[PDB]
Design a protein around this nucleic acid. Structure first.
Ligand SMILES: Nc1nc2c(ncn2[C@@H]2O[C@H](COP(=O)(O)OP(=O)(O)O)[C@@H](O)[C@H]2O)c(=O)[nH]1
Ligand SMILES: [Mg+2]
Ligand SMILES: [Mg+2]
Ligand SMILES: [Mg+2]
Ligand SMILES: [Mg+2]
Ligand SMILES: [Mg+2]
Ligand SMILES: [Mg+2]
Ligand SMILES: [Mg+2]
Ligand SMILES: [Mg+2]
Lengths: 50, 81, 101, 208, 346
RNA sequence: UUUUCUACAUAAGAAUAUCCACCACACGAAAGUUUUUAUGAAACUAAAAACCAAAGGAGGAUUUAGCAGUAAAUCAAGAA
């Protein structure tokens, strides 16, 4: 592992628009969480019954 | 930049370069030839055969040809015919 | 009329769960974060604990929409096995054939 | 059984095919064979035309395989043939010229011999009469007897070893002792024979 | 096939023999186990000579001891015969009365060590007494004459109550490292560095043979009680042994070998030097002579069969036909290690 | 012991129930105690490590299944 490697990583991610600064496996769930459609909102759920 | 980061094996500042340098150091010290230049050494056709052979061995990888080039270059380099 | 009372109950839990969806989402975000202070997270904890729990997602139960049966439903048709088979065997379900191989 | 009764067995021996010209009824027979447009089975993967194939060794190989391991059984057998081989070389070089003429160095001949010698002549079947089961003397067909020998060798060198002892070794010992008839396997064959001799009267009971 | 001693060119694919005392003398260390079987079976130690063995030996004939240490490499497919083509060299130049430093499998160092001892004398290096002691005990019987001759110029401390001061024969050092086993490794490294120091003199003609060099820079199985894996760096034995391949010195010759069989973390099929050694290995290994080792050619093959028939080791009836030859040829792809096994049960 | 481990795909290296005071180890912990993590509003749920290592040493009467790519062993996927 190098610093050049690290800076390239940062560069790439901040380019493609993914996570910027180093973050826990835990906290990433927040990203995943807004990045989705919350389960209760899915048309396949709330509109279940005619 | 780190030199392990590269996509090529550049002969410049290589470890193979240092190793040959020491090799020809001991080769001159054994032959009682007092001529010492990194210029003189690095210039020779032999060190060039090794440039090409090791650059091709790192970048192309393991091959029959490539080790025949390694064979010949180290052959002439170490005086084995 | 929905076919059962159980259905009414779960219809309502669907409507609830659509209602509060974003409160839930937003609050839970802080709650699931290791970056924030714990202090925030305790209060937020009390906050999702606050909102009506008939409005929580896991309290929802897929049923057979026609027949109301709580288990045996096939997700794709939202039907109980009995009803599904019943349809598929008059041939009223498209593209479903009795499988041989 | 994905073969209908229409599919007859392959005959895999090459010596048969290369040299037909001196045999009339067999010429007639294999003519009938392929001319019949006979659907014939894809030859098995275990059966090969290898000059080195001994069917007896194959059977004994199989009967040693637990689960689906051909690899492992093959290896254990290989190591047994090997083990006997080297053990007999060791007996050879440490011996006197006379015994050098005596000793069998072929692990294969040693194997066919140690099995010929372990096979029982008669065996028992239970007969129900008047409420009691009598064990009665039955003459046996060869293949059943072969099976009994092999089964016995395998069961014997499976069961009674001390756990630090590998299979191929013990198996080799039992093979070489059964060669000289002094081995436990033959004790078993003999207890068969004795049990048959004690019950010989009851050989009336058997009706077939 | 006819022979006298190791070095002859026209004798390619002929049977060289050695004695049992020659064998206990030259290989106190391991001989390849399959071949130890061959020998204990046939009462006769027998071998054939190959084109790479010839090549290597002729390079060893032209050697200049004024020149820096020269590296050689034997590479090839699994069971392709590259460890015995090391021993050819071994007993040749041991009959030429040289110093023979032979490590049969480096891999036994890197893997399966019951006792990992911690030594901070060397700043976090681990010593492996089990291996050290065995290696020394073989090395004793290896070269006896040379052991009383070598006079080490150093001061060395085994214990607070134990020391040896300069002017001592080397055999003393060795056997004193064997007697007290806990420090055996330290004594191994010491013997090593002083061996390389004394190689400057004309008394030392050093053949350093390490089979399974890949072990040196490879990734290691052994682990600390924290479950943390330990580098090849962290091993006293290895750290000291890399120093012996370094080409810094005169009078020596290093023949090396890249194994697949004993290795760790490498795939089964990789016989190529750069793979087995990897970047660190290849790089730290400097120009060397890459000697390919391959299958028996037809002549060597019918030679091997000749030899096996000669010993009546083929006990199958039909083994004598051209049929048997074609079978064993096709099943083995005429590979030395494969044919060995095909004959064992035949 | 046709076993167990690591490498690894199917040629390897080591371990191997008794020495003996091992600084216990051979198989066998799926069970428990602890810590995490997954889910979830709610852990009582699942998984993973660390520890611990027990009964078990091939099982009475009697019984189940299988006729070939089957039995047996091994691996992976889906439904909810
Ligand atoms: N006759 C003969 N046999 C050899 C020779 N080299 C190796 N062998 C045999 O072939 C087998 C394979 O050799 P080995 O060097 O151990 O192969 P490796 O596993 O790739 O290192 C060994 O068991 C030897 O007994 C040789 O030069 N002559
Ligand atoms: Mg539910
Ligand atoms: Mg080898
Ligand atoms: Mg093994
Ligand atoms: Mg558990
Ligand atoms: Mg325990
Ligand atoms: Mg017990
Ligand atoms: Mg029954
Ligand atoms: Mg689902």
């Amino acid at each position: 592992l190098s610093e050049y490697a690290v800076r390239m990583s940062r560069l790439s991610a901040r380019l493609f628009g993914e996570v910027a600064r180093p973050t826990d496996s835990k906290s990433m769930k927040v990203v995943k969480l807004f990045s989705e459609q919350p389960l209760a909102k899915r048309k396949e759920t709330y509109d279940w019954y005619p | 930049k780190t030199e392990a980061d590269m996509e090529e094996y550049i002969w410049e500042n290589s470890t193979s370069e240092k190793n040959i340098l020491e090799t020809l150091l001991q080769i001159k010290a054994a032959e009682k030839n007092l001529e010492l230049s990194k210029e003189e050494l690095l210039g020779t056709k032999e060190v060039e055969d090794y440039r090409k052979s090791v650059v091709s061995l790192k970048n192309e990888g393991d091959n029959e040809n490539t080790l025949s080039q390694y064979k010949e270059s180290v052959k002439r380099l170490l005086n084995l015919a | 009329y929905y076919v059962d009372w159980k259905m009414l109950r779960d219809v309502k839990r669907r409507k609830m769960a659509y209602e509060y969806a974003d409160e839930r989402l937003r609050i839970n975000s802080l709650r699931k974060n290791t970056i924030l202070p714990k202090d925030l997270q305790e209060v937020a904890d009390e906050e999702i604990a606050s909102l009506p729990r008939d409005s929580c997602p896991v309290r929802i139960r897929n049923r057979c929409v026609m027949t109301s049966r709580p288990r045996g439903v096939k997700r794709r048709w939202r039907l109980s096995r009995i009803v599904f088979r019943h349809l598929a065997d008059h041939g009223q379900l498209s593209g479903v054939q009795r499988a041989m191989w | 059984s994905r073969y209908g009764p229409e599919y007859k067995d392959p005959q895999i021996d090459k010596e048969y095919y290369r040299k037909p010209l001196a045999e009339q009824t067999e010429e007639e027979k294999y003519e009938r064979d392929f001319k019949k447009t006979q659907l014939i089975k894809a030859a098995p993967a275990t059966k090969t035309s290898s000059v080195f194939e001994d069917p007896v060794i194959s059977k004994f190989t199989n009967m040693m395989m637990k689960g689906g391991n051909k690899v492992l059984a093959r290896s254990l057998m290989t190591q047994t043939l090997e083990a006997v081989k080297r053990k007999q070389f060791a007996k050879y070089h440490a011996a006197s010229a006379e015994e050098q003429a005596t000793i069998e160095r072929n692990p294969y001949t040693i194997f066919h011999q140690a099995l010929k010698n372990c096979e029982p002549v008669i065996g028992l079947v239970p007969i129900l009469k008047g409420g009691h089961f009598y064990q009665v003397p039955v003459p046996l067909a060869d293949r059943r007897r072969r099976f009994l020998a092999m089964k016995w060798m395998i069961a014997e060198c499976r069961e009674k070893k001390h756990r630090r002892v590998l299979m191929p070794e013990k198996l080799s010992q039992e093979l070489l002792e059964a060669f000289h008839n002094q081995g436990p396997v033959i004790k078993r064959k003999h207890d068969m024979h004795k049990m048959a001799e004690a019950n010989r009267a009851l050989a009336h009971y058997r009706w077939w | 096939x006819x022979x006298x001693x190791x070095x002859x060119x026209x004798x390619x694919x002929x049977x060289x023999x050695x004695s049992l005392q020659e064998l206990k003398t030259v290989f106190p260390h391991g001989l390849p186990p399959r071949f130890a079987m061959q020998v204990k079976t046939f009462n006769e130690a027998c071998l054939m000579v190959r084109k790479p063995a010839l090549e290597l030996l002729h390079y060893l004939k032209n050697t200049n001891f004024a020149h820096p240490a020269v590296r050689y490499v034997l590479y090839g497919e699994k069971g392709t015969g590259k460890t015995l083509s090391l021993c050819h060299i071994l007993h040749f130049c041991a009959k030429q009365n040289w110093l023979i430093l032979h490590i049969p499998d480096a891999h036994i160092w890197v893997k399966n060590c019951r006792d990992l001892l911690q030594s901070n004398y060397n700043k976090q290096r681990f010593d492996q007494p089990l291996e050290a002691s065995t290696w020394l005990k073989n090395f004793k019987t290896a070269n006896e004459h040379f052991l009383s001759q070598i006079k080490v110029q150093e001061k060395y401390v085994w214990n607070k109550r134990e020391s040896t001061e300069k002017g001592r024969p080397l055999g003393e050092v060795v056997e004193q490292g064997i007697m007290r086993v806990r420090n055996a490794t330290d004594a191994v490294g010491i013997v090593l560095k002083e061996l390389k120091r004394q190689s400057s003199l004309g008394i030392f003609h050093l053949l350093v043979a390490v089979d399974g060099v890949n072990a040196l820079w490879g990734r290691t199985t052994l682990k600390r009680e924290d479950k943390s894996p330990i580098a090849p760096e962290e091993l006293a034995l290895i750290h000291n042994l890399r120093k012996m391949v370094k080409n810094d010195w005169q009078g020596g010759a290093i023949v090396l070998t890249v194994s697949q069989t004993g290795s760790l973390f490498k795939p089964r099929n990789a016989y190529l030097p750069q793979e087995l050694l990897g970047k660190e290995g290849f790089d730290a290994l400097d120009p060397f002579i890459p000697i390919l080792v391959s299958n028996y050619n037809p002549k060597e093959f019918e030679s091997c069969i000749q030899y096996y028939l000669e010993n009546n080791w083929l006990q199958h009836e039909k083994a004598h036909t051209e049929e048997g030859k074609k079978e064993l040829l096709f099943l083995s792809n005429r590979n030395p290690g494969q044919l060995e096994r095909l004959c064992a049960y035949l």
